[PDB]
């Protein structure tokens, strides 16, 4: 017989024999993230090691089958992934310390408490507190203390761990036919099988910059408008020509500017698009948020959540009795078991993420028919983009009025749309420079172009230039501020969030063609449109089988990320921001700092 068939009957033995292992890792992994115990860290790691051992043993057996003989391309992808030498190229000396460092940096981030300088026994932790302080407080000193203490008491202790994290990871990628660890992540977007739809590791880094350049004019007029409205909330604390203090931004890191809406809302007297206050007054419990999110996907034809979802998902905080990893997570455990773990509070920012995370589940549920190795998003951005297409539609005032969170007599207006668009731009437009800078810092660190003595200098040298954000307090190289975010302590490719955004408006425009839509790219609730849902269902069911360039093209018509739909969505705001910055400065001075 042929060697391709000899390899088909190898993947078949793999797929059926692998699921109960991955699931077993999953169940234990779920039982730790929802229940923090020393008993369950061991159980999670044992099933992770046995799963890893199954990978190593069934990866070596996969090498014997040569790819060049295989012609069925979908078979080639699955063999290609299973033949990849992962941490196996690392010796027992390297792989242990790498895993030990990765666990240690996650636990420091997980167990990161900051003691009040007065009454040291009072300790605030980043998740329950130290995030309300960094999202609601208008005290510059209180924000300065929550931002600096977190990036010094917690950040500095990660500096030695991150330094050896880079070199041990770089030894892995360079061994496994890459240039650095950054290329390993960049290989997610590579297609090298189909002419015309091909892609390269570097083509991403050029497309991102080429598409980020056309975002910069929009970002500047968002930056200038926010700066002028933050100068009122924090008088004598923000330079009208200079950059923005980091702690005064929406969250702990400046990743999202959503919370600044309260300080930057253009027309306050119009009914609030931020329906967070509306939900609490209507006793919207966490179940309703996901139930209302569920009805949204049902309205477009996508399935109900499985019975195992509601029974086995964790939607609230379990309480003080048992701890939990309350970072929002969607789980494709396998075996038809789909769960969402999230510390859902009664807020619009959690209502939208419930749509976002359920978007992952709808993506996860759709490509479950695909073989195990093809059970994944078309790229990293596709998974995040899919959930955002819903929260893009669900955040519209028409949809909010449809679910009872906005007045039944709510009338749209020129002013309300600006309120809605600006709030969206704070979350979407505001995060693009943050994501582009953060990865470009990590990418150059992995390439080595940023030496170890010029790490923190170059982190804020770019944060002032690219993002227009300044350090409130000078930071030694002893600090490790990049790692203060989750996606860097827990080693996740972060460029997925920049690519996500350009996809999400590319998708929504096409989905708002399949749904017969009159007006602009906003006011585009695809809710109740089965044509919009099924057009996405076709893309979701493919998963990784067809190339993401082809998968995107079949949906929107472009083989690459297009920034034009994003700008057309925000064009009523971009024109309005410029007219609100005639008597204001657009841009930022790199040289100004709040400590000079």
């Amino acid at each position: 017989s042929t060697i391709e068939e000899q390899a088909k009957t190898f993947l078949d033995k793999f797929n059926h024999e692998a699921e109960d292992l991955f699931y077993q890792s999953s169940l234990a992994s779920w039982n730790y993230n929802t229940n923090i115990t020393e008993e369950n860290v061991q159980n999670m790691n044992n099933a992770g090691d046995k799963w890893s051992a199954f990978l190593k043993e069934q990866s070596t057996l996969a090498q014997m089958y040569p790819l060049q003989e295989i012609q069925n391309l979908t078979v080639k992808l699955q063999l290609q992934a299973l033949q990849q030498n992962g941490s196996s190229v690392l010796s027992e000396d390297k792989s242990k310390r790498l895993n030990t460092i990765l666990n240690t940096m996650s636990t420091i981030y997980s167990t990161g408490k900051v003691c009040n300088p007065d009454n040291p026994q009072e300790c605030l932790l980043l998740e329950p507190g130290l995030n309300e302080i960094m999202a609601n407080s208008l005290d510059y000193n209180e924000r300065l203390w929550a931002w600096e203490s977190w990036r010094s008491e917690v950040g500095k202790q990660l500096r030695p761990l991150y330094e050896e994290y880079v070199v041990l990871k770089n030894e892995m990628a360079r061994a496994n036919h890459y240039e650095d660890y950054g290329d390993y992540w960049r290989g997610d977007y590579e297609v090298n099988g189909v002419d015309g739809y091909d892609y390269s590791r570097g083509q991403l880094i050029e497309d991102v910059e080429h598409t980020f350049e056309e975002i910069k004019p929009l970002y500047e007029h968002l930056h200038a408008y926010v700066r002028a409205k933050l100068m009122n909330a924090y008088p004598s604390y923000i330079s009208p020509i200079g950059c923005l203090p980091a702690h005064l931004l929406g969250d702990m890191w400046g990743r999202f500017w959503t919370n600044l809406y309260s300080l930057t809302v253009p027309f306050g007297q119009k009914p609030n698009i931020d329906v967070t206050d509306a939900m609490v007054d209507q006793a919207w419990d966490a179940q309703r948020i996901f139930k209302e999110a569920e009805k949204f996907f049902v309205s477009v034809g996508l399935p109900n959540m499985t019975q195992g979802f509601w029974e086995n998902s964790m939607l609230t905080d379990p309480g003080n009795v048992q701890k939990a990893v309350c970072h929002p997570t969607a789980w494709d455990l396998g075996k038809g078991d789909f769960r969402i773990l999230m510390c859902t509070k009664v807020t619009m920012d959690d209502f939208l993420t419930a749509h976002h995370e359920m978007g992952h589940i709808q993506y996860d549920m759709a490509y479950a028919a695909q073989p195990f190795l093809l059970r994944n998003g078309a790229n990293e951005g596709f998974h995040e983009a899919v959930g955002e297409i819903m929260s893009l539609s669900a955040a519209t005032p028409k949809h909010l009025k449809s679910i009872g969170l906005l007045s039944p007599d709510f009338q749209e207006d020129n002013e309300t749309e600006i309120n809605f668009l600006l709030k969206q731009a704070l979350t979407i437009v505001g995060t693009l420079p943050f994501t582009y800078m953060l990865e470009k810092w990590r990418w150059m660190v992995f390439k080595g172009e940023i030496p170890k003595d010029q790490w923190m200098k170059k982190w804020w040298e770019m944060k002032r230039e690219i993002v227009g954000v300044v350090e409130p307090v000078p930071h030694d190289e002893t600090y490790c501020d990049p790692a203060s975010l989750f996606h860097v302590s827990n080693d996740y490719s972060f460029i997925r969030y920049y690519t996500r955004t350009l996809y999400q408006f590319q998708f929504q425009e096409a989905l708002c063609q399949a749904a017969k839509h009159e007006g602009p790219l906003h006011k585009c609730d695809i809710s109740n449109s089965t044509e919009a849902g099924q057009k996405l269902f076709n893309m979701l069911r493919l998963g990784k089988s067809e190339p993401w360039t082809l998968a995107l093209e079949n949906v929107v018509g472009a083989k690459n990320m297009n920034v034009r739909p994003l700008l057309n969505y925000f064009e009523p705001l971009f024109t309005w921001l410029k007219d609100q910055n005639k008597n204001s400065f657009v841009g930022w001075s790199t040289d100004w700092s709040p400590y000079a």
Partner: protein, 196 residues
């Protein structure tokens, strides 16, 4: 004409795996099919070739009832002329099937916690199963051109184990399947209806 013991095979404590299904002859008794209609727990009660309502009015010389446990989405493979892993390697129904296929959920029984790996199924077989065939073979599966004396790179154990867990989704949940066929011969009606 004592009632046909349909309860023994359906309500049985333990159901066999798919690669070795359990066949029980039913004869020398008047069959009450109306008790089968009433049971609402049957998620997939679909007779093929004969309507259930006229089953009580017709008589057969023999009644074969096959019992086994498949996965949730593999129940569709227990159907005429279907293709897949179970239908081609485990239990194939004739394309001209004249009978019934009944299945219900067995999480409460077959599935527990941890993993109920007790149930097995055939993953590889050289030939496709001829209809109403059972392969109990534990002999390996030589996918390659190298002789098979031990489970190795291309020698695979043909049987694999279902992982049945209460957290699994409907597709991966254990379903007990009973298949009632019929067999008309030149013999008296050993299985009849209550009217006759």
């Amino acid at each position: 004409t004592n009632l046909c013991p349909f309860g023994e095979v359906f309500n049985a404590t333990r159901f066999a795996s798919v690669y070795a299904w359990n066949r029980r002859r039913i004869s020398n008794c008047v069959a009450d099919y109306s008790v089968l209609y009433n049971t609402t727990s049957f998620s997939t009660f679909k007779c093929y070739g004969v309507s259930p309502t006229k089953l009580n009015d017709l008589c057969f010389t023999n009644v074969y009832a096959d019992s086994f446990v498949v996965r949730g989405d593999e129940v569709r493979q227990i159907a005429p002329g279907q293709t897949g892993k179970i239908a081609d390697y485990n239990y194939k129904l004739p394309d001209d099937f004249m009978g019934c296929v009944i299945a219900w959920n067995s999480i409460s029984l077959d599935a527990k916690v941890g993993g109920n790996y007790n149930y097995y199924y055939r993953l590889f077989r050289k030939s496709v199963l001829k209809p109403f065939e059972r392969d109990i073979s534990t002999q390996l599966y030589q996918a390659g051109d190298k002789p098979c004396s031990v489970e190795g790179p291309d020698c695979y154990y043909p049987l694999q184990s279902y992982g049945f867990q209460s957290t699994n989704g409907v597709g991966y949940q254990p379903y007990r399947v009973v298949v009632l066929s019929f067999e008309l011969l030149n013999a008296p009606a050993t299985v009849c209806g209550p009217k006759k």
